[PDB]
A paper describes a structure:
3-Phosphoglycerate dehydrogenase (PHGDH) catalyzes the first step in the de novo serine synthesis pathway, i.e. the NAD+-dependent conversion of 3-phosphoglycerate (3-PG) to phosphohydroxypyruvate (PHP). PHGDH diverts the glycolytic flux towards producing serine, which in turn is metabolized and incorporated into a variety of biomolecules including glycine, thereby providing a major source of one-carbon units for the synthesis of purine and pyrimidine nucleotides. Type I enzymes contain two additional regulatory domains, the ACT (aspartate kinase-chorismate mutase-tyrA prephenate dehydrogenase) and ASB (allosteric substrate binding) domains.
Here, in order to better understand the substrate and catalytic promiscuity of human PHGDH and to identify other potential roles of PHGDH that might be relevant in diseases, such as cancer, we have developed and applied functional and binding assays for PHGDH, and have solved structures for the catalytic domain in complex with its cofactor NAD+ both alone and together with the substrate analogue L-tartrate. In agreement with the deposited structure of sPHGDH, two molecules were present in the crystallographic asymmetric unit (ASU). However, while both molecules had NAD+ bound to the cofactor sites, L-tartrate was only present in one molecule, allowing comparison of substrate-bound and unbound states. In both domains, NAD+ was bound in the same way, forming various hydrogen bonds with the enzyme. The substrate analogue, L-tartrate, interacted with both the lid and the core domain of sPHGDH, through a network of hydrogen bonds. L-Tartrate formed hydrogen bonds to R235, H282 and A285 of the core domain and to R53, S54, R74, T77 and Q291 of the lid domain. In the absence of L-tartrate, the lid domain, which otherwise closed over the substrate-binding site, underwent a rigid domain movement. In order to characterize the movement, the two molecules in the ASU were compared using the DynDom webserver. This analysis suggested three structural sub domains: a fixed core domain (aa 100-287), a mobile lid domain (aa 9-93 and aa 289-301) and a hinge domain (aa 94-99 and aa 302). Interestingly, superposition of the two conformations with and without bound L-tartrate showed that the lid domain had rotated by 29° upon substrate binding. Comparison of the two molecules showed that in the presence of L-tartrate a movement of the lid domain towards a more closed substrate pocket had occurred, consistent with the hypothesis that the substrate binds after the cofactor.
Author numbering:
A (entry chain B): 8 to 306
B (entry chain A): 7 to 306
């Protein structure tokens, strides 16, 4: 028995039922209502609106698995789940293309300053000289993290003629070569790159992966994209690089603190940003419905 | 041997001219008055967009034989007045194509994810997630009108995103277009299929208002439109009315029937993103156009 408590694609319920599970769909429930529905349930599927708090988890006696049809666990008390022996699942594949597409958009925006040009036009200005940009053809793109999103960015930007190099400690040079990315050690990467984009998880080993030492090994006027997680690019180092001109531009979808209380990066003229929109598409939201229902049916 | 450069060009342009054995004067920004005086002893003028080579100027410039534009088209040159006085006109139809294609693709992505709007919101100190829901390009259909230099480069880039690419061009066979992945159909069958449409034609009487009230009404509700070609191909009044009703969900404009535009309604619309005619505005394209036009002059 599974409860679906948020508004999901009807393609989730079907698969569950084909797997041999009983389903109940229903949203916008109160705490009390939610706990009552769960009384006979070993499975719950949410997206963002349903708040799977310690209080709900502790009152739901038969529950063994909670699925979120998104990335992260923002609306789930992961710790209370673990005290109770409940497994928490996510959908590591459903968001990949939306995030890769944003990344590529960010790259193009940094080459040509579209978002600053738009702001200028809307202020009534006509600023030709100011927004002289860069042609991507023949430029080198460094891709750090060559998993699901990394390789999708690579084949897209190869169609603009960009040379794609990268680094990933787990993906073989043979696998990367099949999507046209030549692997090298980090220290050989930095000096080659006109653009660098990051697609790694956030771990102790990736916290400040770009920092003051790595920025000094980059080409003068490098442009940087972070559509992964806040913290992979050290934010103080990035502002220093933007102040000196070592970094000519940055695009940020994510921040160490969200919303970010320090505004100096966001306010810089050469920085473009979004409020963590990498998974913010109808299509990504729906693939996630399928992805999580299918894991539950395998379970 | 004397040639004036009257607009701001890549410094490779004069260099080469000088290597050819010509004297050069770079004096961008000049009144009708100042320009005619500079030309008095010149047989060559190279412009970009700001200098207006009018019938007036041409008729006062006694010793001129050749005018070069470091761009496409001849928008700031009176070609009928040059030809009457027997003057040949030069332009650079190749140097800019990839920069224009790249901007076009940037514009498509910006419209799908509202990147310029989201940046403005962030810089206004807000965190507005809910509000910036977007569209994934994969599996969407892109209409491409004009399948020459730029149209075909746009096609191959956007095919890498999984967009289905359809289009129309009166000169390119359906066999040729199919070899770069574009399926040619009559215009009337294109309009209803498209999630995005982008134009890449010259401005001609047949392309003036190629999108208009009648064609917008045959489009899918919520179509998104890009004009990185010339102002006027998309009828501006028809566009604003399509944005107002929701028939068009979004537009991106790099060019205007008047530049800079005095009517601000399109530019001010929340679902419109725009630039000040930046399609050729990259160091590399300006360097190539500079070279392209100087080389023609040295050959003369
Ligand atoms: N912006 C958004 O809203 C959004 C949406 C989806 C995913 N993401 C994020 O984007 C990132 C990438 O996701 P993915 O699905 O491609 O992940 P993945 O797990 O498929 O691949 C990640 C890769 O990162 C590599 N990596 C780890 N440490 C590294 C290092 N030190 N140097 C180089 N590479 C290293 C791993 O070897 C792995 O191959 C994640 O942080 C994810 O949370 C963000
Ligand atoms: N900065 C900028 O924004 C920028 C820069 C360069 C060029 N441009 C413009 O973009 C446009 C295309 O440039 P190009 O080099 O790609 O031109 P091109 O000559 O290589 O191609 C133009 C194509 O449009 C086609 N065409 C003609 N009539 C048509 C119709 N009625 N419907 C559909 N297609 C039609 C022609 O058959 C031709 O193949 C031009 O208007 C050019 O001036 C803009």
């Amino acid at each position: 028995k599974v409860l679906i408590s948020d508004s999901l694609d009807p393609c989730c319920r079907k698969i569950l039922q084909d797997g041999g599970l009983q389903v109940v769909e229903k949203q916008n429930l109160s705490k009390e209502e939610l706990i009552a529905e769960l009384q006979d349930c070993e499975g719950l599927i949410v997206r963002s609106a349903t708040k799977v708090t310690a209080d709900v988890i502790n009152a739901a006696e038969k529950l063994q698995v909670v699925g979120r049809a998104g990335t992260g666990v923002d609306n789930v008390d992961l710790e209370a789940a673990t005290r109770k022996g409940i497994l928490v699942m996510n959908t590591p594949n459903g968001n990949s293309l939306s995030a890769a597409e944003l990344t590529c958009g960010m790259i193009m925006c940094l080459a040509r300053q579209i978002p600053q040009a738009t702001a200028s036009m809307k202020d009534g200005k006509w600023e030709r000289k100011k927004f002289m940009g860069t042609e991507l053809n023949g430029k080198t793109l460094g891709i750090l993290g060559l998993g699901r999103i990394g390789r999708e960015v690579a084949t897209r930007m190869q169609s603009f003629g960009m040379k794609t190099i990268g680094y990933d400690p787990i993906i073989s040079p043979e696998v990367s070569a099949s999507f046209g990315v030549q692997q090298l050690p980090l220290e050989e990467i930095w000096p080659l790159c006109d653009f660098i984009t990051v697609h790694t998880p956030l771990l102790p080993s990736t916290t400040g992966l770009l920092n003051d030492n790595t920025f000094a090994q980059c080409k003068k006027g490098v442009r940087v994209v972070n559509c992964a997680r806040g913290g992979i690019v050290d934010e103080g180092a990035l502002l220093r690089a933007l102040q000196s001109g070592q970094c000519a531009g940055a695009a940020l979808d994510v921040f160490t603190e969200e919303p970010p209380r320090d505004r100096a990066l966001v306010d810089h003229e050469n920085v473009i940003s979004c409020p963590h929109l990498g998974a913010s598409t109808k299509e990504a939201q729906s693939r996630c419905g399928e992805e999580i229902a299918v894991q539950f049916v395998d379970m």
